[PDB]
Design an enzyme around this catalytic site. Structure first.
Site, PDB file in Angstrom:
ATOM      1  N   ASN A 138      23.015  49.151  -7.771  1.00 33.60           N
ATOM      2  CA  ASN A 138      23.669  48.841  -6.452  1.00 33.60           C
ATOM      3  C   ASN A 138      23.328  49.899  -5.392  1.00 33.60           C
ATOM      4  O   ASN A 138      23.907  49.864  -4.307  1.00 33.60           O
ATOM      5  CB  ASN A 138      25.180  48.645  -6.577  1.00 33.60           C
ATOM      6  CG  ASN A 138      25.569  47.734  -7.724  1.00 33.60           C
ATOM      7  OD1 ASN A 138      26.551  47.990  -8.410  1.00 33.60           O
ATOM      8  ND2 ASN A 138      24.801  46.683  -7.954  1.00 33.60           N
TER       9      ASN A 138
ATOM     10  N   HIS B 264      23.861  53.075  -5.402  1.00 35.29           N
ATOM     11  CA  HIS B 264      24.810  54.219  -5.368  1.00 35.29           C
ATOM     12  C   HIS B 264      24.280  55.275  -6.330  1.00 35.29           C
ATOM     13  O   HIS B 264      23.582  54.850  -7.321  1.00 35.29           O
ATOM     14  CB  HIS B 264      26.211  53.760  -5.757  1.00 35.29           C
ATOM     15  CG  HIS B 264      26.783  52.790  -4.791  1.00 35.29           C
ATOM     16  ND1 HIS B 264      27.681  53.164  -3.831  1.00 35.29           N
ATOM     17  CD2 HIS B 264      26.543  51.481  -4.602  1.00 35.29           C
ATOM     18  CE1 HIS B 264      27.986  52.121  -3.089  1.00 35.29           C
ATOM     19  NE2 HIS B 264      27.310  51.076  -3.542  1.00 35.29           N
TER      20      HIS B 264
ATOM     21  N   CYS C 152      28.452  60.973  -3.241  1.00 37.19           N
ATOM     22  CA  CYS C 152      27.301  61.535  -2.484  1.00 37.19           C
ATOM     23  C   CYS C 152      26.421  60.310  -2.149  1.00 37.19           C
ATOM     24  O   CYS C 152      26.171  59.466  -3.034  1.00 37.19           O
ATOM     25  CB  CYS C 152      26.568  62.611  -3.271  1.00 37.19           C
ATOM     26  SG  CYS C 152      24.908  62.999  -2.658  1.00 37.19           S
TER      27      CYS C 152
END
Ligand SMILES: O=c1ccc(OC(F)F)c[nH]1
Ligand SMILES: O=c1ccc(OC(F)F)c[nH]1
Lengths: 265, 265
Positions: free
Chosen positions: A187, A189, A224
């Site tokens: 995804n 991330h 992050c």
């Protein structure tokens, strides 16, 4: 891997790969953390989740996100060895979810590590935490043990301790850390395992050369993003103990805190 | 995995893991490159090595990668089984070749191929040398004797000379540093890491809208744990081609060069 007989836990066997090991030819804690996450995913496939969003979660655009990761390793499996990982989920009533893991020598059937993790519900668009619905609880209680089943049963145990905030100046630091495409999940991330590595990067090479990582506890406060830069900070608190802080290079916004414990080899 | 009937090649099956995939839910070229190195390692283990021969251990010699060539027709999907076959061949006194074929396990059709050139180097001095008869003879017992090429075609993109990118580069990723998950068991930066570092200067829009078909990478010098890499890319073109250079951010010492070819999705 497969659901066990009662369909309330999942087991999978893994052969430790050449590139998965460090300088003592056993699995890194990051390899281990990646295997927990694969068997977590394989369990969710086997029981109908996603293709771990339930049908109600998909409706209101809700997701599970890791709040806490605790791992204790007695023995790191060797290059070429088979490890057996069993995993199950439980409800912490309305607080959120827990996933627990047990790691075994396939050959000996003996416990070589254990891990626990706290998940909370987040909107996904607004990134706002909330209590688990109730309509949601019923849909996943069908897939969890009804009686408590705990990787860490002991009353007062490491996996539940509050972790303090490292005070400047840090004893040690690794600045200017940046994720690459290999650090991202499907995804886009940053993978939760990457943070484990960024925390470990401020430990001196001489400690790593002479000690084995026995316990890691990591709190997840904030993500992050692809274009962020992390500093990794470590102070000895002590067997050796460390307190750990990950924060953004600019504004010093906290992304993680944690502790590690190491034995002499 | 195991040796074939004739014992002159090695086959292994891999289930593609949750964390091994990108935004297409198919395997990254770095997951592919890792799998190739694991099957290469398992073949060397199977035929009695630990990948140095007796004479090389005597003379502190090793194989190091001079070149990697990878072409992918289909990237295997999350949960899919990919079958990889591998064999080596003597290239006279120049060095060895390792070649791979990737197949759909379910269909048996070729979905990728890769070839690599390895040279003999002194561990300590880092000085390249030709292969001595005593060594050529020690490892021809494991290699097909007639030629077997993953890339047979008479004018094939796996052997073309690669030019040096001219400053200014069109694209760049500055200040790339290995972390401990980038190191192998001997504490050298993993050859797959340089592939990722090459891919980091390709704009995200190309990556979102195209698929990597071919990567060709030359290996000139290695990056040490405490070195910093800059990654440079110029478009050299329906198909997008790029030219690549990895260099040390300080003095601009060349570590790698390469080319990639991408098709519109
Ligand atoms: O992005 C996030 C936000 C929160 C979190 O944990 C929660 F418990 F605070 C993990 N990751
Ligand atoms: O450190 C080295 C030495 C040799 C090499 O390959 C050779 F072709 F140049 C790559 N990296």
């Amino acid at each position: 891997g497969s659901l066990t007989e009662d369909g309330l836990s999942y087991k999978e066997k893994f052969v430790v790969r050449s590139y998965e090991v460090g300088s003592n030819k056993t699995a890194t804690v990051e390899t281990i953390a990646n295997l927990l996450q694969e068997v977590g995913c394989n369990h969710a496939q086997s029981v109908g989740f996603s293709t771990a969003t339930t049908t109600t979660m998909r409706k209101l655009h809700l997701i599970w996100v890791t709040a806490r990761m605790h791992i204790e390793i007695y023995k790191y499996p060797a290059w070429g060895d088979v490890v057996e990982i069993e995993t199950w989920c439980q409800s912490e009533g309305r607080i959120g979810t827990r996933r627990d893991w047990i790691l075994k020598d396939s050959v000996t059937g003996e416990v070589t590590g254990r891990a626990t993790s706290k998940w909370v519900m987040m909107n996904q668009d607004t990134r706002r935490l909330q209590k688990v619905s109730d309509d949601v609880r019923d849909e996943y209680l069908v897939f969890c043990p009804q009686e408590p089943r705990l990787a860490f049963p002991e009353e007062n145990n490491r996996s539940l301790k509050k972790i303090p905030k490292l005070e400047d100046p840090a004893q040690y630091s690794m600045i200017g850390l940046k994720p690459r495409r290999a650090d991202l999940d499907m995804n886009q991330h940053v993978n939760n395992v990457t943070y484990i590595g960024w925390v470990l990067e401020s430990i001196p090479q001489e400690i790593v050369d002479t000690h084995e990582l026995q316990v890691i506890t990591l709190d997840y406060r904030r993500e992050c993003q692809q274009d962020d830069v992390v500093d990794s900070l470590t102070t000895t608190t002590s067997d050796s103990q460390f307190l750990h802080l990950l924060r953004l290079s600019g504004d010093g916004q906290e992304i993680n805190r944690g502790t590690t414990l190491w034995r002499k080899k």
